[PDB]
Amino acid sequence: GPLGSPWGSIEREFEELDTQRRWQPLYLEIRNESHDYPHRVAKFPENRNRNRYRDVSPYDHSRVKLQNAENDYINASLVDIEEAQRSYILTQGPLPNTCCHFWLMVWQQKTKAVVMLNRIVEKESVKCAQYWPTDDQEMLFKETGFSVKLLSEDVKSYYTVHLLQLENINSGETRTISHFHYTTWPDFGVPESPASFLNFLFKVRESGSLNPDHGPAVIHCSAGIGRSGTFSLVDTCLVLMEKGDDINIKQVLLNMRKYRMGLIQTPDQLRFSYMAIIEGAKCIKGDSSIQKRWKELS
Numbered sequence: 001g002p003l004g005s006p007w008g009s010i011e012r013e014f015e016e017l018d019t020q021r022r023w024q025p026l027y028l029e030i031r032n033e034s035h036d037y038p039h040r041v042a043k044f045p046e047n048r049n050r051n052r053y054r055d056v057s058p059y060d061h062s063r064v065k066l067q068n069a070e071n072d073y074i075n076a077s078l079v080d081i082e083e084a085q086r087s088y089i090l091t092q093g094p095l096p097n098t099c100c101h102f103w104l105m106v107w108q109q110k111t112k113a114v115v116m117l118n119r120i121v122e123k124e125s126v127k128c129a130q131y132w133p134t135d136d137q138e139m140l141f142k143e144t145g146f147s148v149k150l151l152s153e154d155v156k157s158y159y160t161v162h163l164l165q166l167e168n169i170n171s172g173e174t175r176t177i178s179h180f181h182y183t184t185w186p187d188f189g190v191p192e193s194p195a196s197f198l199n200f201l202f203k204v205r206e207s208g209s210l211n212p213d214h215g216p217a218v219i220h221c222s223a224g225i226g227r228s229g230t231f232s233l234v235d236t237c238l239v240l241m242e243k244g245d246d247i248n249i250k251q252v253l254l255n256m257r258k259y260r261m262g263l264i265q266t267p268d269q270l271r272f273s274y275m276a277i278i279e280g281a282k283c284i285k286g287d288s289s290i291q292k293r294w295k296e297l298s
């Protein structure tokens with residue numbers, strides 16, 4: 001193979017983009033190369049109060065459908081990358097009248113974890129409804145037949161983990177859902193450091209919630225594309241590298257954009273993605289004696 005390290009091709013490209021100050025031109029290339037696909041159901045008149053933003057819609061070919069409901073629509077997309085054995089659902093922060101649909105989808109898709117990357121209020125606007133209880137009262141969603149109870153809360157400096165009990169009233173069953181809340185990632189911004197984002201991702205991974213024996217994890221922010229796209233791109237690229245593939249980050253992101261529009265919203269969020277993939281690749285453990293020496297020396 002090549003003479004460089006496993007991350008050497010990506011690291012050289014990052015250094016060149018910095019020296020030539022070409023992050024804004026590269027972002028514009030990606031925008032111009034992203035094709036549009038039909039999103040007709042999202043624009044039905046009966047779905048207008050189910051969309052948070054008029055310009056952010058799921059594509060018809062990859063939207064998640066609600067089962068046994070008169071209206072099957074929710075603003076959510078299935079992003080499945082079988083080269084990585086990874087599947088995610090990316091979705092908007094639910095509105096007061098769509099929290100009931102959010103929990104129905106979580107049940108029907110056999111999801112184990114919800115990853116939340118926004119605050120409820122940001123710059124004096126509401127970005128997402130309060131869809132889980134903060135105290136010991138049960139929170140009822142009568143339109144779809146679900147109730148939710150807080151089981152535990154662990155607060156750290158830049159994220160919080162809640163364990164939640166989700167009850168299906170119609171089937172007489174319950175499940176424990178892990179709720180991973182990143183509390184210090186600003187709208188259209190970046191996390192405080194690669195190290196802080198990576199510690200959060202490794203905690204999500206350690207719970208088993210991203211493994212193929214569970215349904216897809218539900219990832220959301222406010223619109224479900226900027227911060228959510230950054231999180232999913234970094235996780236996918238790290239899986240492919242651990243598998244041994246020689247990856248091109250521009251190509252992976254354009255492929256993921258075929259499943260949901262507009263993933264990654266600023267040039268700085270793109271640059272942060274490169275940084276987190278390089279530093280995470282140095283944390284990979286494996287069997288190769290060569291790869292271990294590269295890690296020590298780097």
Ligand SMILES: O=C1CN(c2c(O)cc(-c3cnn4c3CCCC4)cc2F)S(=O)(=O)N1
Nearest residue numbers: 053187188189221222223224225226227265
């Ligand atoms: O970093 C990020 C940025 N996000 C984000 C976004 O991408 C788009 C919009 C959006 C779409 N239409 N309109 C607005 C805002 C105001 C008026 C109209 C809002 C957002 F918070 S995000 O996806 O939540 N993660």
